[PDB]
Each structure stands twice: as structure tokens, then as C-alpha cells.
Amino acid sequence: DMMYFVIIMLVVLMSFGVARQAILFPNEEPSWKLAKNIFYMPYWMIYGEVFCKTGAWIVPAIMACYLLVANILLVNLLIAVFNNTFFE
Amino acid sequence: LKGANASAPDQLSLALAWNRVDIARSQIFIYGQQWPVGSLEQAMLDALVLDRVDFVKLLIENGVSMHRFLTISRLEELYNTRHGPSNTLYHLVRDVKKGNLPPDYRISLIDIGLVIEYLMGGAYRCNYTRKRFRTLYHNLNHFPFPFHELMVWAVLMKRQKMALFFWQHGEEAMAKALVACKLCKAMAHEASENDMVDDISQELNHNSRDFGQLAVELLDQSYKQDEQLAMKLLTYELKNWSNATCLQLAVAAKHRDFIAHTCSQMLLTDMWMGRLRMRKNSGLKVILGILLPPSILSLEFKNGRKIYEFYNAPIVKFWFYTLAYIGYLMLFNYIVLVKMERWPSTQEWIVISYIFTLGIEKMREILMSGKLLQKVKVWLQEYWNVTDLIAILLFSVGMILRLQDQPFRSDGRVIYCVNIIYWYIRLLDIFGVNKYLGPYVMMIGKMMIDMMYFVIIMLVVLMSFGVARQAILFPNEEPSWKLAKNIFYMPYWMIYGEVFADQIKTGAWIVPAIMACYLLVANILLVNLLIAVFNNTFFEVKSISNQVWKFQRYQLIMTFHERPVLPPPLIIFSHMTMIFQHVCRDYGLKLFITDDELKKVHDFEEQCIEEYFREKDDRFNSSNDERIRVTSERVENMSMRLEEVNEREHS
Amino acid sequence: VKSISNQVWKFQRYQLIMTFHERPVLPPPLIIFSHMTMIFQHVCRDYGLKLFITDDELKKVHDFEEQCIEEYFREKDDRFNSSNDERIRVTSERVENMSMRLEEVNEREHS
Ligand SMILES: COCC(CCO[C@H]1CC[C@@]2(C)C(=CC[C@H]3[C@@H]4C[C@@H]5O[C@]6(CC[C@@H](C)CO6)[C@@H](C)[C@@H]5[C@@]4(C)CC[C@@H]32)C1)COC
Ligand SMILES: COCC(CCO[C@H]1CC[C@@]2(C)C(=CC[C@H]3[C@@H]4C[C@@H]5O[C@]6(CC[C@@H](C)CO6)[C@@H](C)[C@@H]5[C@@]4(C)CC[C@@H]32)C1)COC
């Protein structure tokens, strides 16, 4: 069950990370550094480490939605699943 | 009876009017009654219209045969009767005929056929409205299956006991059960619409539930007795019920418990695998065969042509679509992560072509689904289609905006970055095919509501605290939109662990106190209450999600059976094949059988229903309540008899 | 706790309805007008609380209630007399009485 919820969390996290990195940095030459910025910060920012370009104001809004979905909707569901599949 | 000294039909009519069946069973039907010719059928006709189940059964048991009794004229007289309980057949006839009928209008079988075709659905075509029957009815017999018409008559006129009696006699029991369930449900909806007395709208649902339960029990008995014949019974074309399988009738009736049964799941899996025999390990070998055409011939096919037979299996089409979608997603990520040129790159053109092909395929699908406005309403009934339309339109406006001046180019790139989130999220629909990822996605969808109902209160408290703190700390702010940002921002980041005691004047010391109260309320009470709510509303939600997923397997299988072989990115070739052919379901939907197999299946179903009824009666007569009641009655009777015996004194 | 909360909310619906039925039409920000027009009328529930009825309808309602209570008592008695415990007890008593009577019958010997 941990693995399944990890799969879903990875999908959502990659979506948010790619969207934010694409919005903020528009002039990046193709390099392997791009493949690291889409996973690193969105993964560290769900464990309590929370912190002009055109349309830069959408980043805090999508960040709020991402935190409210990943840190609330899925974690509590995982808790419920662990709770109700325990006796057997 | 013996005082009248009249003929047997007169005594029988008296007993029929009194609704006393045992008197007729004992006194009337005796050794050599010498019934006049035509008397028994007249008594059967009289007993039908008065709703006497016991007398109809008794007359059937003593020589009356429905195959000779029932004609077109007698059925017509049955449909126009008045000496019975209330029914809503006349209102349905009026609605179908749009109220043009004169008062005391004489109903005809064509009107009943129109009512049935209106009630069943869209593709239904009743046997009454076909050309052959209309020709035979204009120039004026026999009914090959009388019990079908008798059961339909009993269901439409709302006589439940007669319907249950006619259900167990004759062939095609499951088809009759499913059709009756659908008709009762549709009539309940129609009566609830036109402001009826509202007892009808809660008795017709009871009738529908009874018929659905009977169909499920009969399917369970058939599957227990034999699996291959049960699966063959669920697929053969029903000639008498507008050319549909039992599965399609179950799906149109929205009967979730019938599809969720194990037999239906095995049949749908065997449809999903197509012509391939592989059952122990699929998926990885399917994509192996997709990538390696030499690996295709090393597989096993059920009884040159192997490649064409392989590409038409639904599972191979599904995996091809999944691989194409994953490739498109990778190209989308690549074109949004790197710098954008003045003119689009090759991968951007691939993405645009894929989106255009998907859009035109969706519009072709909505254009092949009669009246234009009705297909739109049916196709917009799903949230996925609406989201696809919104995403495609937004992507089109981005494409229009992207090929313009530099600020418009930046705005188009931003709209692409925003739009990629939906195409990343939509992988959950692909995951719904998996046996475990479907129910969890449905469960998340159901828990969204409980999440929102606490998001509301969290917003209320958060806005209160933010306004209080911002008003205390900053007293000389000119009215600007910056004020509307400090209300929500910091108090929202402070509940996710980003609490800054350093970043928090007259009365400035109240800010830490209200901050402590706000943290203790928001991050302790509401969160744990939400956890408790999610915990205690989980079992029913997961069972419902499992049932709904098992029901939607059929729709997914049919959707990928209708799908063309090529994936959307290169669907252009087959999108112009039907254009030239316009001016120019052997299995996976039905299963055509011959006459001998049809007769064998009918006898099998009859044996199953007889066995099921016998088992039910045997189970009922051996339960504790029945034994206790019968023992009490016999003990009381014996006590009275023994009191009578001891009362006498010959001494 | 949730069952108790549901019950209490369903109970308090009535008080909320009566509270908003009594209140004046105007909202508090502009209630000053109805707060001074009521002063002048001092020296000058057709439905929503009750329902005044006629006499014939009153007779009909009384007969309906009497039929309902009679039916309810008859149904309760019929349900009670068919339960398993009652049948077991009555059967045991009748079997014991019958056994005593049959012992008396077989006790006599006219042979
Ligand atoms: C510094 O100079 C180096 C240069 C070499 C340039 O290499 C580039 C080649 C393309 C490559 C590997 C680069 C950056 C982002 C890479 C993408 C990250 C995305 O993330 C994924 C992963 C998860 C998916 C679900 C979504 O997308 C990939 C498919 C996507 C990806 C792997 C597609 C290919 C991209 C680097 C040499 O010059 C000759
Ligand atoms: C820099 O110069 C700009 C100036 C324009 C001045 O615009 C001001 C107009 C009033 C406005 C929009 C401003 C600041 C706070 C705004 C409030 C935030 C509050 O938050 C809410 C939201 C949630 C509610 C439940 C509580 O209050 C709003 C109702 C409340 C609000 C929208 C009421 C109106 C206020 C900006 C131009 O000079 C001509």
C-alpha cells in the first residue's frame, strides 16, 4: 500500500515540479540539471520544508493547491487504509 | 353450488367471483365433469382479467393450454380490461401518442409496441412494430411464445403476482427477468415525473428490485451448476427481445450486482483477452509482442492471419494507446522544459498533431453516437469529456497566441505550462484499468467532498487570523491590492510547518497569543477530526468503489473494442479511410449460435430454474420457524382431538 | 458523537424556523424603520405556527387517528402472538397438559 500511494504521489509531484520549473526558468539549455529540478524541491517541500517572469504569480497558487492535495487528501487516506487493514 | 343444479361453467363462475379456490378444487373438478367445449378457455379468459392467480394455475393444471388459448384478439381484450387494479398504462399510451387519442380510445398492439420502445431505450425495436406483424395485423392467430407476452402484459398493468407466476414458465427466463426489471424501473421514473399518487413510484421500484434479485440468483445457480453453459447463456443473440444479449440488457438496466458477479467478470476478461490464450502473465508479454513482431508468432492463439488477429484484441489496442500517450507526455515535458524558439520545433509539431488528431477523433465519436442535441448531452454526461474539451480549447488558444509577438509568445508558453498539469494528471484514467488503482482513484474522488467541507472552515479561521494580525501590525497602509494578499498567504504557509516566530507598535504582543490559539485550533482540532471522518467513512466507500469499478469494466472493454487499431498520433491514416469507403461483431459483442445449441441452452436454463425453485422450497420447509409453527398448530389440533376423545365416557 | 449531533441538529431546525418566522422583514442594518414604526402602532399566525381547521375536517381527522391507533394495537398483538418465544411456551404448556390427560386416559383399564 505504501508503494501504491508512492506511485500516485510521484505523479502529482512530478506534475507540479515540471509546471513550476517551466514557468520560472524559460531560457534553459537542455542539460541533465533540468531532470533534477523537477523532483528535488517538490519532494523536500512536502516534509515541512516549505518556502518579473511572465505569469510568475501562478506558482504560489499551484503550490497551495499541490500542498493541500498531497499533504491532506492522500496522507489521511493512507492512514485510513493502514487503519482498516490491520486486524487480519 | 348443489342447490342451483346448473351447468359446470355456472358453478365455476360463481367460485371465480367468490375467490374461493379450494371449493372449486374439491367440489367442482371431480370424476367426469363433462365440460362443454370452449368452457374452460372462457373461464381462463374471465380469470385473467380479474387477477386470480390461483384460478389461472388451477385451470392450467386441468387441461387448459396457453399455446391454444392465447390469440391476438384475446391479448387485445386483456390489454383493454377494466375489472382490475389501478394501472398507469393509459397515461403512458397518452404520452406516447401525444394526447391525440379521443376519449374511450381502443388500444391496439401497435400502441403497446410503441410504449415498449419508448420505455426500453433508444436502440430497442419491439417485435410488435416490425413490418411483418403490422402486415399480419392490418389484414385481420398464433403466438410462438405466449408466456413472453403474458409476462409483459402483467408487468405493464402492475400485477406483480401474475408476473411472478408467468416468469417461471417458458424459455429465456433471464431475459424475461432483466426486461421486466428495466420496464419497472422506467415506469417508476415516468410515474415519478408526472406527479402521480407517489405510491406507484415506490412500488414499481420494489418490483424492479425483486426482478433484479431473481435474475442474479438464477445466474448464480447457473454458474454454480456449469460454467461453460452459463457463459454461453450470457452472450447468444435473443431473437425475441430486439436482438440483444443478456449482458446488454443488464447494462441498460444499470443492474450493478449482475455485472459484478464472478461469471460476468470471467466473461468480460475472456472478451478483454480477445483471441489470445495467455492468462498466467500478460501485459509485459503483450508489449513484448507489440515491440517484437517475431515474438507474436511464439504466442498461442485460440481456434499471416495471426498478426491481424493479434492487433484486433482490445488489450493490444489499450497498450498501444498507453504507449502513445506516454510518448506524447514525454515530448510535452521536453518542449516545455527547454527554450522556445520563434518557430515551433519538431517535437512541438508532433504534440500539436497529436492534440488535433485526438480532438477530431473525439468529435467524430460524438458524431457517430440521432438528433444532434441529444448526442451532445449524452457525451457531455462524463467529466472526462468536458475536461478534455476545455484542455483542447485552451491548448488551441495557446497555439493561436504562441505564433504572435514576443509578449504574446511568452503568454502562450505560460498557458502551455499551465495546461501540462492536466495531461500529467489524466494518467489516473489510464491507471483505472489496473485492478488496484481503480478503486483508490474512485475513493479519492469520493473523499474530495469531505475534504472540501473542512477546507471551508479552515479558510474561515485562517482569514480571521490573517486579517487580525495584518491589521494589528500595519496601521498606516494605503488601500491597495497588496492588502488582499497578506490576509491569506502567511497564515496558510504557517500551517504546513513554515511557522516563523521571527517574522511575527501598540498592542503588538497580542500577535503571538492569537498565533498560538490559531495553531492549536487549526493544526490540532480540525486535522484530527478530518482524520477521524476519513477513517470512519471508509468501508462502505471502498465497497461501493469496488462495485462501481467492476461495473465499468464492461464500458471500458466495449470502448476499446470499438476503437480503431492505430493510436491517436498516427490515426490520420485511418481517419481518411472511412471517407473513401463511405461513397464506395462476430465476437466481443454477441455470439451467434445455431438451432440445436439454442434448444440445448433452453433446456439447460429450464433445468436450472426448476432446480433453483425446488432448492428454495426445500430450504424454506426445513427452517426452524416453519417447523416451530407447524408443530404448534399440529399440537393444538391434537390437543383438541384428544380432549374430544377423553370427553366421551362409555363406562 | 455524530449520531447525537445529527439528532440535535434535526431538533434545533424547529427553533431556527420559529426564530426566523418571528423576525421582521428588514435586515439589522436598515431595521431602524421597523424599529420606529412599531412604536407608533403601540398607542394606535395563520400558518407557520398553527392550522385552523373546520369541524367536518376535525371529525375526519379524529376518525383517522382512531383507525390508526386500532390498527397499531392489532398489529402489535398479531406480531407478538406469532413470535418464536410465544409459540414455544404455548406448545410446551399444551404438550404438558396433553401428556397429563393421556396418562389419565391410559390409567383406566376396562379390560
Ligand atoms: C550541457 O550540455 C549537455 C548536452 C546534452 C543535452 O542533453 C539533454 C538531452 C535531452 C534531455 C535528457 C535533457 C534534459 C531534460 C530531459 C527530460 C527530462 C524529462 O523528464 C521526463 C522523466 C519523467 C517523465 C514521466 C517525464 O519526463 C523525461 C521523459 C524527460 C527528459 C528525460 C527528455 C529528454 C531531456 C538533457 C551535450 O551537448 C551536446
Ligand atoms: C495603489 O493604488 C491603487 C488604488 C486602488 C485602490 O484599490 C483598493 C480598493 C479597495 C480594496 C479592493 C483594496 C484593498 C483591500 C480590499 C479588501 C480586502 C478584503 O478582503 C475581503 C475578502 C474576503 C472577505 C470575506 C473579507 O474581505 C474583501 C471583501 C475585502 C476587500 C476586497 C474590500 C476592498 C479593498 C484596494 C488606485 O488609486 C486610485
PDB file of all heavy atoms in Angstrom, chain C residues 53-73:
ATOM      1  N   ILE C  53     -58.716  24.683  11.491  1.00  0.00           N
ATOM      2  CA  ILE C  53     -59.492  23.796  10.640  1.00  0.00           C
ATOM      3  C   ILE C  53     -60.970  23.952  10.975  1.00  0.00           C
ATOM      4  O   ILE C  53     -61.346  24.565  11.974  1.00  0.00           O
ATOM      5  CB  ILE C  53     -59.058  22.326  10.773  1.00  0.00           C
ATOM      6  CG1 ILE C  53     -59.432  21.785  12.152  1.00  0.00           C
ATOM      7  CG2 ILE C  53     -57.566  22.185  10.527  1.00  0.00           C
ATOM      8  CD1 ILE C  53     -59.120  20.319  12.327  1.00  0.00           C
ATOM      9  N   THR C  54     -61.808  23.381  10.116  1.00  0.00           N
ATOM     10  CA  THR C  54     -63.251  23.409  10.291  1.00  0.00           C
ATOM     11  C   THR C  54     -63.673  22.276  11.227  1.00  0.00           C
ATOM     12  O   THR C  54     -62.844  21.641  11.883  1.00  0.00           O
ATOM     13  CB  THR C  54     -63.946  23.322   8.935  1.00  0.00           C
ATOM     14  OG1 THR C  54     -65.324  22.973   9.122  1.00  0.00           O
ATOM     15  CG2 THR C  54     -63.274  22.281   8.054  1.00  0.00           C
ATOM     16  N   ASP C  55     -64.978  22.012  11.302  1.00  0.00           N
ATOM     17  CA  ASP C  55     -65.485  20.962  12.177  1.00  0.00           C
ATOM     18  C   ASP C  55     -65.570  19.611  11.475  1.00  0.00           C
ATOM     19  O   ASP C  55     -65.242  18.582  12.077  1.00  0.00           O
ATOM     20  CB  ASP C  55     -66.857  21.358  12.726  1.00  0.00           C
ATOM     21  CG  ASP C  55     -67.319  20.458  13.857  1.00  0.00           C
ATOM     22  OD1 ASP C  55     -67.639  19.277  13.603  1.00  0.00           O
ATOM     23  OD2 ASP C  55     -67.355  20.934  15.010  1.00  0.00           O
ATOM     24  N   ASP C  56     -66.016  19.589  10.217  1.00  0.00           N
ATOM     25  CA  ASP C  56     -66.105  18.326   9.489  1.00  0.00           C
ATOM     26  C   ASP C  56     -64.727  17.711   9.285  1.00  0.00           C
ATOM     27  O   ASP C  56     -64.549  16.496   9.453  1.00  0.00           O
ATOM     28  CB  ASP C  56     -66.800  18.543   8.146  1.00  0.00           C
ATOM     29  CG  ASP C  56     -67.130  17.240   7.445  1.00  0.00           C
ATOM     30  OD1 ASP C  56     -67.118  16.185   8.112  1.00  0.00           O
ATOM     31  OD2 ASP C  56     -67.401  17.272   6.227  1.00  0.00           O
ATOM     32  N   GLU C  57     -63.740  18.532   8.931  1.00  0.00           N
ATOM     33  CA  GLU C  57     -62.381  18.023   8.818  1.00  0.00           C
ATOM     34  C   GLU C  57     -61.856  17.559  10.166  1.00  0.00           C
ATOM     35  O   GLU C  57     -61.084  16.598  10.229  1.00  0.00           O
ATOM     36  CB  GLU C  57     -61.466  19.089   8.222  1.00  0.00           C
ATOM     37  CG  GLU C  57     -60.237  18.530   7.533  1.00  0.00           C
ATOM     38  CD  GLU C  57     -60.579  17.694   6.314  1.00  0.00           C
ATOM     39  OE1 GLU C  57     -61.644  17.926   5.704  1.00  0.00           O
ATOM     40  OE2 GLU C  57     -59.782  16.801   5.961  1.00  0.00           O
ATOM     41  N   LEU C  58     -62.270  18.218  11.250  1.00  0.00           N
ATOM     42  CA  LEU C  58     -61.891  17.769  12.584  1.00  0.00           C
ATOM     43  C   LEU C  58     -62.437  16.376  12.869  1.00  0.00           C
ATOM     44  O   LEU C  58     -61.727  15.517  13.407  1.00  0.00           O
ATOM     45  CB  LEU C  58     -62.392  18.767  13.623  1.00  0.00           C
ATOM     46  CG  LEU C  58     -62.079  18.484  15.087  1.00  0.00           C
ATOM     47  CD1 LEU C  58     -60.619  18.764  15.373  1.00  0.00           C
ATOM     48  CD2 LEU C  58     -62.976  19.315  15.985  1.00  0.00           C
ATOM     49  N   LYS C  59     -63.697  16.131  12.502  1.00  0.00           N
ATOM     50  CA  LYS C  59     -64.274  14.802  12.667  1.00  0.00           C
ATOM     51  C   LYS C  59     -63.526  13.772  11.830  1.00  0.00           C
ATOM     52  O   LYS C  59     -63.248  12.657  12.298  1.00  0.00           O
ATOM     53  CB  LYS C  59     -65.752  14.828  12.282  1.00  0.00           C
ATOM     54  CG  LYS C  59     -66.464  13.501  12.434  1.00  0.00           C
ATOM     55  CD  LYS C  59     -66.985  13.322  13.845  1.00  0.00           C
ATOM     56  CE  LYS C  59     -68.012  14.390  14.180  1.00  0.00           C
ATOM     57  NZ  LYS C  59     -68.570  14.215  15.549  1.00  0.00           N
ATOM     58  N   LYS C  60     -63.189  14.134  10.589  1.00  0.00           N
ATOM     59  CA  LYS C  60     -62.444  13.222   9.726  1.00  0.00           C
ATOM     60  C   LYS C  60     -61.093  12.870  10.333  1.00  0.00           C
ATOM     61  O   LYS C  60     -60.691  11.701  10.339  1.00  0.00           O
ATOM     62  CB  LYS C  60     -62.257  13.843   8.345  1.00  0.00           C
ATOM     63  CG  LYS C  60     -63.547  14.069   7.581  1.00  0.00           C
ATOM     64  CD  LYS C  60     -63.338  15.030   6.420  1.00  0.00           C
ATOM     65  CE  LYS C  60     -62.230  14.550   5.498  1.00  0.00           C
ATOM     66  NZ  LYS C  60     -62.507  13.190   4.959  1.00  0.00           N
ATOM     67  N   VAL C  61     -60.386  13.870  10.861  1.00  0.00           N
ATOM     68  CA  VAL C  61     -59.074  13.637  11.453  1.00  0.00           C
ATOM     69  C   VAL C  61     -59.190  12.759  12.694  1.00  0.00           C
ATOM     70  O   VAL C  61     -58.365  11.861  12.911  1.00  0.00           O
ATOM     71  CB  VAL C  61     -58.387  14.979  11.756  1.00  0.00           C
ATOM     72  CG1 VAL C  61     -57.160  14.771  12.607  1.00  0.00           C
ATOM     73  CG2 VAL C  61     -58.005  15.667  10.466  1.00  0.00           C
ATOM     74  N   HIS C  62     -60.209  12.996  13.527  1.00  0.00           N
ATOM     75  CA  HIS C  62     -60.387  12.164  14.714  1.00  0.00           C
ATOM     76  C   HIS C  62     -60.646  10.711  14.339  1.00  0.00           C
ATOM     77  O   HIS C  62     -60.067   9.796  14.938  1.00  0.00           O
ATOM     78  CB  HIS C  62     -61.530  12.697  15.574  1.00  0.00           C
ATOM     79  CG  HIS C  62     -61.177  13.923  16.350  1.00  0.00           C
ATOM     80  ND1 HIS C  62     -60.049  14.668  16.091  1.00  0.00           N
ATOM     81  CD2 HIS C  62     -61.805  14.535  17.381  1.00  0.00           C
ATOM     82  CE1 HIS C  62     -59.997  15.688  16.928  1.00  0.00           C
ATOM     83  NE2 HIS C  62     -61.050  15.629  17.722  1.00  0.00           N
ATOM     84  N   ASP C  63     -61.510  10.477  13.346  1.00  0.00           N
ATOM     85  CA  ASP C  63     -61.760   9.102  12.924  1.00  0.00           C
ATOM     86  C   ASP C  63     -60.514   8.467  12.321  1.00  0.00           C
ATOM     87  O   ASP C  63     -60.260   7.275  12.536  1.00  0.00           O
ATOM     88  CB  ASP C  63     -62.922   9.051  11.937  1.00  0.00           C
ATOM     89  CG  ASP C  63     -64.268   9.197  12.617  1.00  0.00           C
ATOM     90  OD1 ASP C  63     -64.295   9.343  13.857  1.00  0.00           O
ATOM     91  OD2 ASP C  63     -65.298   9.163  11.914  1.00  0.00           O
ATOM     92  N   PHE C  64     -59.724   9.244  11.578  1.00  0.00           N
ATOM     93  CA  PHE C  64     -58.473   8.732  11.030  1.00  0.00           C
ATOM     94  C   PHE C  64     -57.514   8.305  12.135  1.00  0.00           C
ATOM     95  O   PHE C  64     -56.914   7.225  12.067  1.00  0.00           O
ATOM     96  CB  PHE C  64     -57.834   9.796  10.143  1.00  0.00           C
ATOM     97  CG  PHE C  64     -56.396   9.540   9.827  1.00  0.00           C
ATOM     98  CD1 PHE C  64     -56.039   8.564   8.919  1.00  0.00           C
ATOM     99  CD2 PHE C  64     -55.402  10.291  10.421  1.00  0.00           C
ATOM    100  CE1 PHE C  64     -54.718   8.333   8.618  1.00  0.00           C
ATOM    101  CE2 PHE C  64     -54.078  10.063  10.126  1.00  0.00           C
ATOM    102  CZ  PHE C  64     -53.736   9.083   9.223  1.00  0.00           C
ATOM    103  N   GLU C  65     -57.367   9.136  13.167  1.00  0.00           N
ATOM    104  CA  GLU C  65     -56.470   8.803  14.269  1.00  0.00           C
ATOM    105  C   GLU C  65     -56.958   7.577  15.030  1.00  0.00           C
ATOM    106  O   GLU C  65     -56.152   6.735  15.445  1.00  0.00           O
ATOM    107  CB  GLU C  65     -56.336  10.000  15.205  1.00  0.00           C
ATOM    108  CG  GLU C  65     -55.355   9.807  16.335  1.00  0.00           C
ATOM    109  CD  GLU C  65     -55.273  11.024  17.232  1.00  0.00           C
ATOM    110  OE1 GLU C  65     -56.005  12.002  16.978  1.00  0.00           O
ATOM    111  OE2 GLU C  65     -54.476  11.007  18.192  1.00  0.00           O
ATOM    112  N   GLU C  66     -58.273   7.466  15.231  1.00  0.00           N
ATOM    113  CA  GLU C  66     -58.818   6.291  15.904  1.00  0.00           C
ATOM    114  C   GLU C  66     -58.559   5.022  15.102  1.00  0.00           C
ATOM    115  O   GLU C  66     -58.184   3.983  15.664  1.00  0.00           O
ATOM    116  CB  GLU C  66     -60.313   6.479  16.151  1.00  0.00           C
ATOM    117  CG  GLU C  66     -61.028   5.229  16.615  1.00  0.00           C
ATOM    118  CD  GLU C  66     -62.518   5.447  16.772  1.00  0.00           C
ATOM    119  OE1 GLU C  66     -62.911   6.563  17.168  1.00  0.00           O
ATOM    120  OE2 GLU C  66     -63.293   4.510  16.493  1.00  0.00           O
ATOM    121  N   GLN C  67     -58.746   5.085  13.782  1.00  0.00           N
ATOM    122  CA  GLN C  67     -58.452   3.923  12.954  1.00  0.00           C
ATOM    123  C   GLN C  67     -56.974   3.562  13.025  1.00  0.00           C
ATOM    124  O   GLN C  67     -56.619   2.379  13.093  1.00  0.00           O
ATOM    125  CB  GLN C  67     -58.872   4.186  11.512  1.00  0.00           C
ATOM    126  CG  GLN C  67     -58.905   2.942  10.652  1.00  0.00           C
ATOM    127  CD  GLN C  67     -59.525   3.195   9.295  1.00  0.00           C
ATOM    128  OE1 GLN C  67     -60.187   2.325   8.731  1.00  0.00           O
ATOM    129  NE2 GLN C  67     -59.312   4.392   8.762  1.00  0.00           N
ATOM    130  N   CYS C  68     -56.100   4.572  13.031  1.00  0.00           N
ATOM    131  CA  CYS C  68     -54.666   4.313  13.117  1.00  0.00           C
ATOM    132  C   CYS C  68     -54.292   3.632  14.426  1.00  0.00           C
ATOM    133  O   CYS C  68     -53.506   2.679  14.431  1.00  0.00           O
ATOM    134  CB  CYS C  68     -53.882   5.612  12.960  1.00  0.00           C
ATOM    135  SG  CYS C  68     -53.793   6.216  11.272  1.00  0.00           S
ATOM    136  N   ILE C  69     -54.834   4.103  15.551  1.00  0.00           N
ATOM    137  CA  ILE C  69     -54.449   3.510  16.830  1.00  0.00           C
ATOM    138  C   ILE C  69     -55.000   2.092  16.956  1.00  0.00           C
ATOM    139  O   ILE C  69     -54.320   1.193  17.473  1.00  0.00           O
ATOM    140  CB  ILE C  69     -54.868   4.409  18.011  1.00  0.00           C
ATOM    141  CG1 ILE C  69     -54.380   3.819  19.327  1.00  0.00           C
ATOM    142  CG2 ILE C  69     -56.359   4.595  18.086  1.00  0.00           C
ATOM    143  CD1 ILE C  69     -54.828   4.599  20.527  1.00  0.00           C
ATOM    144  N   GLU C  70     -56.220   1.855  16.460  1.00  0.00           N
ATOM    145  CA  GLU C  70     -56.758   0.498  16.470  1.00  0.00           C
ATOM    146  C   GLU C  70     -55.904  -0.440  15.626  1.00  0.00           C
ATOM    147  O   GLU C  70     -55.577  -1.556  16.058  1.00  0.00           O
ATOM    148  CB  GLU C  70     -58.200   0.507  15.968  1.00  0.00           C
ATOM    149  CG  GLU C  70     -58.638  -0.780  15.300  1.00  0.00           C
ATOM    150  CD  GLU C  70     -60.009  -0.666  14.663  1.00  0.00           C
ATOM    151  OE1 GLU C  70     -60.801   0.194  15.104  1.00  0.00           O
ATOM    152  OE2 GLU C  70     -60.291  -1.432  13.718  1.00  0.00           O
ATOM    153  N   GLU C  71     -55.511   0.006  14.431  1.00  0.00           N
ATOM    154  CA  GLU C  71     -54.670  -0.814  13.569  1.00  0.00           C
ATOM    155  C   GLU C  71     -53.320  -1.089  14.215  1.00  0.00           C
ATOM    156  O   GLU C  71     -52.798  -2.205  14.125  1.00  0.00           O
ATOM    157  CB  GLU C  71     -54.489  -0.129  12.216  1.00  0.00           C
ATOM    158  CG  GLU C  71     -53.375  -0.700  11.371  1.00  0.00           C
ATOM    159  CD  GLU C  71     -53.604  -2.149  11.018  1.00  0.00           C
ATOM    160  OE1 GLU C  71     -54.777  -2.541  10.843  1.00  0.00           O
ATOM    161  OE2 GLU C  71     -52.612  -2.900  10.919  1.00  0.00           O
ATOM    162  N   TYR C  72     -52.740  -0.083  14.868  1.00  0.00           N
ATOM    163  CA  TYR C  72     -51.446  -0.262  15.517  1.00  0.00           C
ATOM    164  C   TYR C  72     -51.520  -1.294  16.633  1.00  0.00           C
ATOM    165  O   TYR C  72     -50.646  -2.162  16.741  1.00  0.00           O
ATOM    166  CB  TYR C  72     -50.951   1.081  16.047  1.00  0.00           C
ATOM    167  CG  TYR C  72     -50.028   0.989  17.234  1.00  0.00           C
ATOM    168  CD1 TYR C  72     -48.726   0.550  17.090  1.00  0.00           C
ATOM    169  CD2 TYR C  72     -50.454   1.366  18.496  1.00  0.00           C
ATOM    170  CE1 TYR C  72     -47.879   0.475  18.172  1.00  0.00           C
ATOM    171  CE2 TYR C  72     -49.616   1.295  19.582  1.00  0.00           C
ATOM    172  CZ  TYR C  72     -48.329   0.849  19.416  1.00  0.00           C
ATOM    173  OH  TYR C  72     -47.488   0.778  20.500  1.00  0.00           O
ATOM    174  N   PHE C  73     -52.558  -1.224  17.473  1.00  0.00           N
ATOM    175  CA  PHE C  73     -52.681  -2.210  18.544  1.00  0.00           C
ATOM    176  C   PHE C  73     -52.907  -3.611  17.993  1.00  0.00           C
ATOM    177  O   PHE C  73     -52.325  -4.583  18.496  1.00  0.00           O
ATOM    178  CB  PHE C  73     -53.804  -1.827  19.500  1.00  0.00           C
ATOM    179  CG  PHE C  73     -53.357  -0.947  20.620  1.00  0.00           C
ATOM    180  CD1 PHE C  73     -53.833   0.342  20.738  1.00  0.00           C
ATOM    181  CD2 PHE C  73     -52.458  -1.412  21.558  1.00  0.00           C
ATOM    182  CE1 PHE C  73     -53.418   1.151  21.771  1.00  0.00           C
ATOM    183  CE2 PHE C  73     -52.040  -0.608  22.591  1.00  0.00           C
ATOM    184  CZ  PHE C  73     -52.521   0.673  22.698  1.00  0.00           C
TER     185      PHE C  73
END
